[PDB]
Symmetry: D2
Subunit: 463 residues, 4 copies
């Protein structure tokens, strides 16, 4: 529109291209678009003012415009420095939506962008809803703008790491507003986290290095939802995949799924010494992928022992899964192309351009699927963002900020969406594939003790 | 010396069974680690356990583990076709009352169960129940409620059995507390899924020796058993289509690379032949039911199936397939035990060279156990370690010695704590030679767990 | 009163007949050959010496040959591969057959002799069907005069073809032969997909071991090694592959397998020191697939992880040094064709000894020894090639040719690709597949007839 | 600097290309092993090679291996979309004449091949040819047959080019001997299959970022490229159907777990819309042509495909798909380079929010090279080690200098000896850390081979 400058993107001329890709993505997101069409007439989010912090991809564009189509105002930023698709951010800004995001931000630019959503015209925006991915915006609000939380009705957190931070604040009494855990919807956790990484991990590695994967040796650290999806991403390409875990139930699943379970440390004991590193094992690894959400699971001693020219990447939320700090202090970095670096283990000052003793680090340790590719595909993010919309509507309509203190105390929690809504999202996803769900006969529904409409499983069911 | 309190097919198979039990013990490290750890403590001394579960080699290692920990048992199988006779023989030969053989009649099945409940014509002084499917539990509540006054708890193996317990509980008709063994992760996401992955194609190959690559399969259900069964067939190279009523499970099937379809047009089962997607069913070479529901492969579906298609059921009960319709209308030709050609040409007789027949396996009973040996020992290790832990817990709680006011406060259906689930998993991983990494204190602090676990909140779905 | 046979138990015939009727519905290419050649009786006057695993599938092959006019006399080419109900049904039909499951070496030799001799004198045989070359060898060495009446040999398997080619090179082969093995609808169907189906099948029936999560070493990656490797990997085994052929080793790499050697740096010097004891100490299962000699040797057997399974799916048992195990280690029979080999010695064994290996079928081909071999729908391809090869060599009548015309025909050849394609189409139709027909322009564009053959003879598929 | 005998998109991308060249060298052990082995001998001293093959990073390593062995070259790409611009830049910057860029026109493509043939308006004194698809070979035979008098041979990369050579050989129009590089096992059974397995789903993801799991694909053809393409999609969770005209290849698709279908009712392509299986084609989300044939995805098939289906080709030439019909009848909307929405609602104009469109990748050109980067270095290593050995053998044979009677005995289309195929394979295996076992003397004697090989008869199909 004419006069709109309340944004900061890399190249506004990319908007036409981004619009072409948003129009394709709408065709790939039936659950999310079905909610857009379902709630359009009602406008369940009229009056919502949403602070959003999540990877500014084409898929997030569809989510953003869905929220706007339901009545909300939003101010947006990405939750990672390398995850933004610049044509997505351009198309959103061209639509008149405040978005501060580009691919390749510095740490300072990243913090600047979140603050640009928090502040409008040099004063705290009168926001009343928060959509977060990783909890960085939630942390800035609680630590730097706590008075704004007196007007916010709730937070809808996208990812595992963010939910852990919320539960930590709830346990310490420091969480100021209720939240919905979007991550643990089955149409999110067991779809986004697992199948998303199956699609996008080997995608990112091929775009970054164009390395053949078949026949090579991989070590996946972690076998949660992301580790499961990451392991399959590599194994389906023909890699020989070994899996590390601290959780023996997950380790049991890796074994039964056909993976050898190993540890980087002798007998799994990480005493911090070089002698504890299984140097024979790590000397045969061509690719190491961290998937834990933990800290320093690919440490300095492991990086020193890795086979020459191995690829190192992280698909967990934060870069501290790999001890990149050590590599910056001790090893020379040679940039191949954006988000692909050769780390030369021959010393800090300078490198031989034909040196063979280097490692290849992708996205400088940041989420590799979004950093070196485009993250999850639209048809997978459909489930996650459908949940986001439902979670926004529910928390906004509850109107926590307006309740009396006694009613607040009953509502101050971290909850998940009801299974029935989970099932309804899954149903639209299945129809997108052309799948046909069978309806129970009344006699059958009575036999197993469920309604014909569902829910079909008890809340304890793990799928 | 003069042990006669048993009924098996052939006691002379005992030596063979002992040889296979010794092998199975090396495949079951978690169960044997329990046997080693608790042998001296004798935590089941005084326990008198009525056991009703498939009398396989694997159940034999379970039985002898309970006996090793101090228990007395009386045992029957929970399916007429699932017993391995050499395993029943080795257990009888060791002086353990067992009433089980492959190929029981329905009457013999009920009689075997009663032989565990009655000793010398009187009710045995049982105080513990181990059940698989809830048949023994039902007979106890229905025909012997006085025995339940002395029983400290039930440990239920399987999905169908847990559902029947939860129905009794909401109806106020459950008399003793139960432990839901099924919903240990080292049971449900191990036994139910991976076990059927191993044993479904196994049983189909033993029954028919049919090539599976390139042929078309329809799996009804995509719960844990349906997941495992679908993989059992897809890894053989079948083109597998999946049916579901649960849209979340259907979503998983699509993402796992399967076409999700319905036997009925637009998914609507109106009971008429016109509802049958006859085009789809006419292309199916193999159908497998996995639901725990009733009549999910109904008469109209059986009428529409491709000639010479194979029909089998791997859920707990045979009413998933309308076998009664087939007994009533079609002529049965036995190829060999637990393999029948069912001739759709009529009831009275059949032409030996008729081409319009179906092949039914295990007369619609659990096919992995009926036509093969069920799950392998190293998978049943997880399930049966959980059973031993469940039996110790309920026996040590001594529910039946509580006043009526306290019984009411502890009458429930619970699962084992996650810490025990993890410890069973550790011994399973070690059995494969896997090495679990230990968290550093700062790593445990960072994700908010103890170094030793539990590593996941109770909400985690794995 | 037919008595010209010997089987385990003739009362199994009705059961075998029931399974033959099912097998026919799984073998459309073979049954199609019955319908196509029935009226013409192209093997009328043929008298076939047959030596191949007496399975239900072989039963349908036998009766297909008879339906086309032939008389046969049958034995099995392995001591453990007979299905007794199949042999029973063949006998009951009035067909001379000498085969049962669990023959001794002596009885095996006696069974071949019974097919060769009728009433104490050599049968007037004129055709040979063989699987592995044992019948071929006995005729060439013990009854060379019968070969003057025989029009040809149709040899099933890689080991047999290799023996034939040595005799051809050495000028000792008497009659022409058809390499049935190297039809694509045989080698790239039977040897590969067949073992994919039947290797894990046999391991499950013998041991009921979980395979998922365990470590396997497959020795060899030819057609059998390729299918065997896939049989285990699809169950979830972590499979390592050994090879002497770098091209085959390259395929294993690209297929997602780690390529390893039992010997350090791949050099086998015959000493325990050459053994990669750390590799072997992790292996839960080893399978030999080479057709070579002693590829699972004594030093490898000493070094295997306790309680590993050892088995062979090549044609002969000498792939595994079972001789060494019979000499030094105590054998405990678990059940027929399943033995625990106690590495503690030969002076008895502790029934609870933990240091043993499990050997299947005493090293004989394990898919047939501990299960039922390949499924009917796979053997359909192989045995359609066998019938066509029988007709091709029989209609040529080499034994009646003038001497000055025999040299042109004394060879070992494969069937023409047109026959290979004809068998393949019938298999594809068995699966409900629909083959696209080229338009004339498309056929012109790629330079083939619309009728085929569709590939040059150089093509490898 | 001073040197202007090239044309690339952007010479300033050279340092980037050089960085990726250095990485590729570490991924190409067989190609670099020939570089080291023959560097001292200079076996291509005097060779002047015209090269026409996709100007990628992998081709760069091939080009610099030839130069390192003493050759001079003049290079162009064999496809308008397959060049990597940073690779062409690094080559031109190394002083090597190269005429290639991503996104040429058909005129510029021909012009590039002409600029290698001609130096300063006159024909270069070439004596060797390296070709991929036969376009350069065709241009020499038709338009510069005088240059062939002094050329010692052709090394053809791909199946389509070998076919064109064998036609010329049969007709007697082939002027110089050729080596079929394609049919080395370390080429056909590595490049053609495994390469497409890697790069087909890679290209589609880069073009569309479409989820592939759970969607329906139809692969036209099941040769080596079809086999790899089918696996590329199946391994991602697609439901893959396979079409074929060759029953043997069709039998392989069945046994590999694929449903084999024809786009035509009963497989009869009579040229009418009635012959189209509209039901089948209405369910397909992605079609991929792999045939090397013409019009195997015709106009009626395109009219019948599901809305928003993806259409691409990974055969050598774009005429596998009838893109001519689409240019004449439908409106093309460019999403981004090499990605077009083809709106089936008319020829002139389109609604930006129209839903009846197909997505065509690379305008029908080879999708793996057009929308991604083709095969990975470690795979092209095998193909390009064969190319070097092939060039060495034909250049040293010096055909163009041989007596007429010798010319006649050597004018053929031949493959490399199996011993060299094995030697290439061995270096690829060592590149993976694989360990090849050495036969003992007795074992080699038992199977009738040298301990050094070759290990298989020439008839072996692997
Ligand atoms: N990049 C993406 O597209 C994407 C998508 C979803 C989530 N995520 C992020 O990925 C991370 C993992 O998420 P998740 O859903 O898989 O969580 P999860 O809890 O399901 O899995 C993490 C696993 O790591 C294991 N682990 C922890 N410390 C370990 C160590 N030192 N060594 C080995 N294993 C260890 C734990 O046992 C656990 O099973 C989170 O930070 C989440 O926010 C990323
Ligand atoms: N044979 C074995 O070894 C074995 C092992 C474990 C459990 N079981 C039995 O198998 C059954 C299933 O066990 P589970 O743990 O997988 O249960 P589950 O609840 O996880 O799965 C059953 C599935 O069937 C689906 N379903 C229900 N009705 C349906 C219908 N009409 N059509 C299609 N799908 C339908 C449900 O939505 C559900 O996902 C139970 O009877 C259980 O006792 C057998
Ligand atoms: N059991 C069955 O159902 C069945 C079916 C077909 C063939 N076979 C038999 O299996 C054997 C193999 O047949 P094939 O078609 O695979 O032959 P093949 O030539 O295609 O493969 C054998 C492979 O073994 C490799 N090899 C040889 N010695 C080796 C060693 N010491 N270490 C490692 N690798 C070694 C060779 O390089 C070759 O690639 C033959 O004896 C054949 O008759 C058995
Ligand atoms: N893009 C790449 O990276 C790449 C790599 C190698 C080869 N190629 C090219 O791909 C093409 C195929 O090469 P190839 O080695 O697989 O050849 P191939 O001969 O091995 O395979 C082609 C197959 O197509 C089948 N076919 C022909 N017409 C058909 C039709 N109308 N319908 C269905 N199937 C039909 C044939 O029967 C044959 O099996 C050639 O043009 C080749 O140059 C591309
Ligand atoms: N494409 C994507 N868009 C937004 N959030 C994501 N998380 C993972 N992939 C994503
Ligand atoms: N082998 C087995 N033994 C006992 N119960 C089982 N359930 C499934 N397989 C079993
Ligand atoms: K994306
Ligand atoms: K079992
Ligand atoms: K069989
Ligand atoms: K590349």
């Amino acid at each position: 529109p004419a006069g709109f400058t309340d944004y900061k993107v890399a190249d506004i001329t990319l908007a036409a291209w981004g619009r072409r890709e948003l129009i394709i993505a709408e065709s790939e997101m039936p659950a999310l678009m079905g909610l857009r069409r379902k709630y359009a007439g009602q406008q369940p989010l009229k009056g919502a003012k949403i602070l959003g912090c999540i990877h500014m991809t084409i898929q997030t564009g569809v989510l953003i415009e869905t929220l706007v189509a339901l009545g909300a105002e939003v101010r947006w930023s990405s939750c990672n420095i390398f995850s933004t698709q610049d044509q997505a951010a351009a198309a959103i800004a061209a639509a008149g939506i405040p978005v501060f995001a580009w691919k390749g931000e510095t740490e300072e630019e990243y913090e600047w962008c979140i603050e640009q959503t928090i502040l409008k015209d040099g004063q705290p925006w009168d926001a009343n809803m928060v959509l977060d991915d990783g909890g960085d915006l939630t942390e800035i609000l609680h630590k730097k703008y706590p008075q704004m939380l007196e007007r916010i009705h709730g937070i809808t957190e996208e990812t595992t790491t963010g939910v852990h931070r919320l539960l930590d604040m709830l346990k310490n009494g420091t969480l100021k507003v209720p939240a919905i855990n979007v991550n643990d919807s089955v149409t999110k956790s067991k779809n986004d986290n697992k199948y998303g990484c199956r699609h996008s991990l080997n995608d990112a590695i091929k775009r970054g290095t164009d390395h053949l994967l078949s026949g090579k040796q991989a070590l996946v650290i972690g076998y949660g939802d992301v580790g499961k999806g990451s392991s399959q991403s590599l194994r389906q390409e023909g890699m020989i995949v070994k899996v590390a875990e601290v959780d023996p139930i997950c380790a049991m699943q890796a074994c039964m799924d056909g993976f050898e379970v190993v540890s980087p440390y002798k007998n799994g004991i990480n005493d911090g010494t070089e002698a504890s590193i299984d140097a024979a094992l790590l000397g045969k690894i061509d690719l190491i992928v961290t998937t834990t959400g933990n800290v320093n699971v690919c440490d300095a001693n492991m990086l020193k022992a890795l086979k020459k020219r191995a690829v190192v990447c992280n698909i967990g939320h934060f870069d501290n899964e790999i001890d990149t700090a050590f590599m910056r202090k001790n090893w020379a970095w040679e940039e191949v192309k954006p988000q692909v670096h050769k780390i030369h283990r021959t010393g800090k000052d300078g490198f031989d351009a034909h040196n063979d003793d280097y490692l290849i680090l992708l996205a400088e340790g940041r989420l590799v699927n979004l950093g070196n590719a485009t993250g999850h595909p639209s048809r997978i993010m459909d489930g996650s963002f459908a949940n986001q919309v439902l979670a926004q509507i529910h928390l906004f309509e509850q109107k926590y900020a307006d309740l009396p203190a006694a009613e607040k105390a009953k509502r101050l929690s971290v909850e998940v969406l009801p299974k029935k809504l989970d099932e309804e999202v899954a149903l639209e996803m299945v129809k997108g594939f052309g799948g046909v769900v069978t309806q129970l006969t009344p006699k059958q529904a009575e036999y197993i003790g469920v309604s014909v409409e569902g829910p079909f499983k008890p809340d304890t069911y793990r799928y």
